[PDB]
Design an enzyme around this catalytic site. Structure first.
Site, PDB file in Angstrom:
ATOM      1  N   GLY A  51     -16.378  95.340  40.529  1.00  0.00           N
ATOM      2  CA  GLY A  51     -16.978  95.826  41.756  1.00  0.00           C
ATOM      3  C   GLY A  51     -18.113  96.803  41.507  1.00  0.00           C
ATOM      4  CB  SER A  52     -20.532  98.285  43.871  1.00  0.00           C
ATOM      5  OG  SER A  52     -19.566  98.154  44.893  1.00  0.00           O
TER       6      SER A  52
END
Length: 642
Positions: free
Chosen positions: A384-385
């Site tokens: 994820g980010s």
């Protein structure tokens, strides 16, 4: 003579092979006729001899060496060899076997004697085996708290005769079902099983708590059994034990057929250390009982205890904070790698699994779409980010990223050119057009990360990524696959490269490997390998990212919490020194056209480096996030790990 000496060698070896494979008929059919100075028994009597004696000791894997076949008479060849075998009491080694062969017509057979079962048997000697079960070791906290132990459980059951006849029977059953939280249909199906006799004790459930009032026909008996005090909160990690089967004994005769075997988790990973060794004596006796030779004897050795880095209060808080949703939480002391918590949600009842579970309840676990049997802390996900931190650190190291240079980013979507088609890197806010590194980390700006990754390029991006632990097998008693950057050694895609830059693409990193990678920020760019066994030594990997990069990024990660628009700002309520990074991952599963979303939180104490946390919510419901659920665990870690 050498032609027949070879035929003898071949016969002895074919014999040994049939005994090794457990085909006792085939071995008996290689023996000469029953006579004095021939075979002591018939073929069937030989079969039954091996089946009883080798079956009683669970003999497995007969291997021989130092075979000699000489000649004696015109039709009599004498053989000898050394042998070893496995039994339920360990390996029997250094056995001196001895016999004679017979050559009549054109084939060679074995003059079978009882000393071809065990070496010093003769006539009508008998074999005795006595065994004492080993007690299973414990699994314990970093402070000695039991995670898996052997306690005395209260077993509820009913005796069908002491229940009644008609109306009193139905009424008592109703009372049991309502006083012990059972169903009337369950109690009736129980007492109606084929095996039940009217006077028998039919066990129903294990009563955890205080025994209520006991209606007519109900009884509480004590039984010994494995017990999991944290329950489902640590089920995936600890695992559960089950009944040992005939097929487990065939693969490992050193088990106890009467005992329990670990079926998943740490109970199975450490089953050898925890099970102990069986005690007892294998002996040859006389026409009756009178011992003549002890073949194997040793006393029972109870299992050893396993002491974990886990903190059972952190484990319970981590698991409860997930609220039964799909997700996982890993907590470490990042300077040593100690794994304080490995929670996976949703979960199953390990005490129910080990104390006999319904086929319906078990199948409910297996058909649950959120799959409670999964160990989510050991499953690879796109990170994820959150992964922007790593990309940033790499970009600061190789001089691609100036912390104070701004990129001009307009709107909510961005793509490099039209060849990207309908793919577009997305950001949540368009309120900031001039985006530097601190702004990108505070607001979780994927377009910044995507553009800086594309500018860096694949070579420099991979050179930075390769300094981490992609491809490495962590030294952990947890089954896992090594993290990967992508499917192949090259991205061969500007889209996939940009995608990887903010933690998506083909990246697969399980939560434990993520906590390993993110530990660089709590150790000035040194990676510290995670550790689950308390006595193990701290291992690390130096110069993964630069100390300058750490000192640039961590103050920005503080602002992720302190800034009024930082994505983790709700954690500033806590009033504790926090560095954090939120994240999301967009996933397209085939059974839904609308995509699913994973929510990530990374947080640690930037003042003392005493704790670190990586939490994730899988396929999150709307308005849900890992950050929303982290305050309790963060308060606890901050209080007790400095």
């Amino acid at each position: 003579e050498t032609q027949a000496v070879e035929a003898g060698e071949k016969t002895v070896e074919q014999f040994v092979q049939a005994l090794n494979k457990g085909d006792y008929n085939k071995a008996a059919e290689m023996t000469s006729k029953k006579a004095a100075n021939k075979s002591a028994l018939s073929e069937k009597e030989i079969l039954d001899k091996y089946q009883n004696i080798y079956g009683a000791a669970d003999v497995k894997g007969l291997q021989i060496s130092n075979l000699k076949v000489d000649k004696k008479d015109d039709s009599t060849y004498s053989f000898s060899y050394k042998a070893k075998m496995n039994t339920s009491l360990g390996e029997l080694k250094d056995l001196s076997y001895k016999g004679t062969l017979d050559r009549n017509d054109g084939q060679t057979t074995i003059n079978w004697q009882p000393n071809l079962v065990f070496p010093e048997m003769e006539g009508n000697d008998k074999v005795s085996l006595t065994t004492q079960e080993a007690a299973r070791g414990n699994i314990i906290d970093r402070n000695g708290e039991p995670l898996a132990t052997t306690g005395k459980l209260k077993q509820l059951g009913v005796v069908p005769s002491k229940l009644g006849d008609g109306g009193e029977k139905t009424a008592n059953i109703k009372a049991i079902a309502s006083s012990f939280d059972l169903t009337e249909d369950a109690i009736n199906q129980a007492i109606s099983q084929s095996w039940v006799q009217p006077d028998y004790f039919v066990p129903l459930k294990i009563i955890d708590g205080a025994t209520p009032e006991l209606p007519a026909g109900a009884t509480i008996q004590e039984v010994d059994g494995r017990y999991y005090p944290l329950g489902e909160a640590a089920a995936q990690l600890i695992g559960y034990v089950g009944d040992i089967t005939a097929e487990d004994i065939d693969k490992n005769p050193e088990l106890s057929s009467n005992g329990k075997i670990g079926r998943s988790g740490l109970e199975m990973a450490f089953d050898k250390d925890l099970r102990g060794t069986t005690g007892g004596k294998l002996s040859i006796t006389d026409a009756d009982g009178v011992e003549k030779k002890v073949l194997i004897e040793h006393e029972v050795q109870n299992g050893k205890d396993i002491k974990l880095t886990i903190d059972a209060k952190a484990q319970k808080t981590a698991f409860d904070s997930l609220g039964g949703k799909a997700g996982s939480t890993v907590a470490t002391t990042p300077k040593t790698g100690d794994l304080l918590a490995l929670a996976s949600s949703p979960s199953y009842d390990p005490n129910k699994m080990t104390n006999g579970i319904s086929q319906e309840d078990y199948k409910a676990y297996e058909e649950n779409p959120e799959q409670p049997f999964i160990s989510r802390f050991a499953t690879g996900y796109a990170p994820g980010s959150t992964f922007k931190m790593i990309t940033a650190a790499i970009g600061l190291d190789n001089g691609t990223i100036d912390p104070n240079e701004v990129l001009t980013i307009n709107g909510l979507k961005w793509q490099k050119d039209s060849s990207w088609g309908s793919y577009q890197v997305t950001r949540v806010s368009s309120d900031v057009s001039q985006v530097d590194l601190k702004t990108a980390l505070i607001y979780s700006d994927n377009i910044y990360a995507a553009q800086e990754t594309l500018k860096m390029g694949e070579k420099k991006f991979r050179t930075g990524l390769d300094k981490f632990i992609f491809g490495e097998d962590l030294d952990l008693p947890i089954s896992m696959n090594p993290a990967q950057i992508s499917n192949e050694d090259s991205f061969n895609s500007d889209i996939l490269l940009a995608d990887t830059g903010y933690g998506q693409g083909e990246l697969l990193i399980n939560p434990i490997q993520q906590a390993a990678m993110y530990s660089v920020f709590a150790n000035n760019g040194t990676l510290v390998y995670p550790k689950l066994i308390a006595d193990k030594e701290t291992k690390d990997k130096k110069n993964v990212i630069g100390e300058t990069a750490v000192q640039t990024i961590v103050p920005d990660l503080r602002e992720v919490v302190q800034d009024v628009n930082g994505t983790a700002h709700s954690l500033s309520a806590l009033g504790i020194p926090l560095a954090a990074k939120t994240g999301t991952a967009e996933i397209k599963e085939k059974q839904d056209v609308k995509g699913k979303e994973n929510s990530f939180l990374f947080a640690f104490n930037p003042d003392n480096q005493g704790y670190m946390m990586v939490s994730m919510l899988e396929n999150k419901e709307d308005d849900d996030s890992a950050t929303k659920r982290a305050s309790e665990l963060l308060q606890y870690l901050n209080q007790n790990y400095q």
